[PDB]
Structures are given as C-alpha cells and as structure tokens.
Write a protein that binds this ligand. Structure first.
Ligand SMILES: CC(C)=CCC/C(C)=C/CC/C(C)=C/COP(=O)(O)OP(=O)(O)O
Ligand SMILES: [Mg+2]
Length: 339
C-alpha cells in the first residue's frame, strides 16, 4: 500500500494534455453508421423491457450511448443489423456492471455460460430459464438474433469467444505493467465484437484465414491497440475511484516515471503496435483471383481496426470516461486527475 499511496501522491491533481489518439492510426478512418439516431429510438423502447434498474439503464444510455459505439464499430452495415449489435453492447456493459458476492459471481458466470451454450450450442434453446437474472435473461434473445445473422462457423467462434470472456471475468502489491497488459490481452472482451462484424456485414471469413499467422497477428495487434488507448482514456475515470491497476499508473510505479512519461510510453506503444499490425497485412493470404474472398478478408481486418479506432472515437464522443468539455476542437484531451 506504500506503492499505492506513492502512486496516488504522484498522480493527484496532475493535468495531462493528450493528443488525438486517432492521429496515431492515420490509415484507419473513423466513420458513423447513418442510422444511429433511428436505431437509438428502437433501443430506448427496447430498454424499458430489460430487467435492470431504470436509473442504471439511463446512466448507461446517457453516458455510454452504446448504439453510437456500434455505429462506429460497424459504420457500413445495413440498418437491420444495427439493433442486435447495439443490444449486445448494452448487454455486455450491463453485465459487466452488475457482476462488479464471490458466490454471486460464480453463479452469474455459470448462468451466463449456460445461456451462451443454450443459444449458440448444437441444441439451441432460446428460452431463458425461469427466474433468470436480468443481465442473463436479456442475453438469450440477443444471441438468437446474432446467430440468425451468422454462419455456423462464425457462430462457433462467437460461442467460444463469449465463453472465454465470461470465464476470464470469473477468474479475475501492484502488478507489473507488462503482466497487467498480458492479462488484459487474454481477458478483454473485444473479440466478440470483431466476430460481430461478420453479423454486421453478413459474411464469413474462412477458419483457415482466421487461423493464419498474419490474421491472428492483426487480431492481436488490434486487441493490444484497443487496450492501450483504453488505458490512457480511462485513466481519469479509474484513478478517481482509486483503481490503480491502470497501465499508465503501473509504469509510473514500476519504472519510477512521471505520469506524463508513462502516458508517452503508452502512446509510443500504440504507434509500435499500429506499425506491426499494418505490416501484417502484406503477409495475409490474399487471393490472386477471388474478389469476394479478398473482400471478406478486407472487411474482416477493417473490423479489427475499427475496434481500436472506434473505441477511441466513441470515447471522444460520449461521457463515460471524462467530461467532453475536457476536449478541444483538435480532439486534444486534457486529463484532470483531481479526486
Ligand atoms: C470490458 C467491457 C465492458 C468490454 C465491452 C466491449 C469492448 C471490448 C469495448 C472496447 C474496449 C473497452 C472499453 C474495454 C473496457 O476496459 P476496462 O475493463 O478497463 O473498463 P473501462 O471501459 O472502464 O476502462
Ligand atoms: Mg480501463
């Protein structure tokens, strides 16, 4: 706790100007699905049905605005796609929020895994068991709808990915910053969103391509990029509740560096990972002849990239992490670690 106390003292009241993160990934553009407002209306009507407290749901909706995040993740999807994707994001955020006792966690995760199995499994049952908790009950219709837009191959991937995320959650002095990063890479719930691009754009990437070293690398780099940008962006929010296991903070503690230096390091890491990810593209098994196949490969990688850029763009466009007034019109964010 000496470590934590020192971290708090060093961080506290510091204001750091952060450059536009999107600039760090110049090749990858940020776009918005045209129907976000209309879909939001559907989502608002849908939210009333969901068994989570009205104030919590509104807080998520006003601060989070997950339909917008989905619109950013999948800007080119047909409008009909938007509802299920928006709904899933609401589920994942609600679910994470409710789970945050230990027994409660084991029970919810088991119930959640069961739902994932019932919905995405070989013998599909979309009916929630009676008395399902709200975060569980809501999931069944969403998985059924997503499955409807997915091939069995895409469905299998989604199922494993959802299991992996739920299990990671169940299985969660200061940790080494590198150790923290790796846990997040294994732990993070981004992958289901990448697979969801297949739903959004109604296509299936072949497993042989998905398992290719270059594709596996692009998925990994994009996962790393999303985590790294999240670390900086969420720093103010996390520090304020004294959640000191944030990578910027860990670098301060581990290397005895200033908060400014640690953020700079993370920014450099982003550039490094962006560069690796871009380099990986040449290595992909592009078809000499197949336009549809190459289109599928292109779409799939764009989905991964959007996970990184979109997460940052959405962060710059909602109030989950900081007051928007903290952002200038060059998209430069002034973090304030006043607590
Ligand atoms: C975990 C979660 C809700 C994932 C939803 C899907 C997803 C991968 C969204 C983008 C990445 C992200 C915001 C991760 C959360 O980081 P964090 O766990 O440090 O939480 P923070 O958003 O408060 O920083
Ligand atoms: Mg975070």
């Amino acid at each position: 706790s000496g470590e934590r106390r020192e971290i708090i003292r060093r961080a506290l009241n510091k204001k750091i100007l952060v450059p536009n993160i999107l600039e760090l990934m110049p090749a990858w553009p940020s776009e918005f699905q045209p129907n976000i407002d209309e879909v939001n209306v559907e989502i608002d009507e849908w939210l009333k049905t969901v068994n989570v407290a009205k104030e919590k749901k509104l807080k998520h909706r006003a601060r989070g605005n997950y339909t917008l995040l989905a619109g950013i993740y999948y800007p080119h999807c047909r409008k009909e796609k938007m509802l299920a994707l928006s709904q899933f994001l609401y589920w994942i955020f609600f679910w994470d929020d409710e789970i945050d006792d230990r027994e409660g966690t084991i029970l919810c995760c088991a119930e959640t895994n069961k739902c994932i199995n019932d919905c995405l499994g070989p013998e599909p049952n979309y009916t929630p068991p009676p008395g399902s908790r709200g975060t569980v009950e809501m999931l069944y219709p969403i998985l059924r709808d997503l499955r409807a837009g997915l091939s069995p191959v895409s469905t299998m991937r989604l199922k494993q990915e959802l299991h992996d995320y739920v299990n990671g959650v169940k299985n969660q002095h200061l940790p080494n910053p590198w150790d923290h990063f790796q846990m997040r890479v294994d732990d993070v719930g981004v992958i289901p969103s990448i697979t969801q691009n297949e739903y959004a754009m109604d296509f299936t990437l072949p497993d042989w391509i998905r398992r290719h070293e270059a594709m596996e690398e692009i998925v990994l780099q994009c996962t790393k990029l999303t985590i790294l940008l999240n670390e900086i962006l969420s720093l103010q929010k996390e520090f304020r509740v004294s959640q000191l296991e944030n990578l910027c903070l860990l670098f301060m503690n581990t290397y005895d560096m200033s908060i400014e230096q640690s953020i700079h390091k993370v920014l450099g890491l982003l550039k490094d990972h962006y560069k690796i990810c871009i380099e990986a593209e040449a290595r992909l098994p592009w078809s000499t002849t197949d336009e549809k196949l190459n289109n599928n490969i292109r779409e799939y990688i764009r989905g991964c990239q959007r996970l990184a850029t979109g997460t940052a763009c959405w962060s710059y466009n909602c109030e989950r992490y900081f007051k928007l007034s903290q952002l200038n019109d060059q998209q430069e964010l002034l973090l304030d670690l006043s607590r």
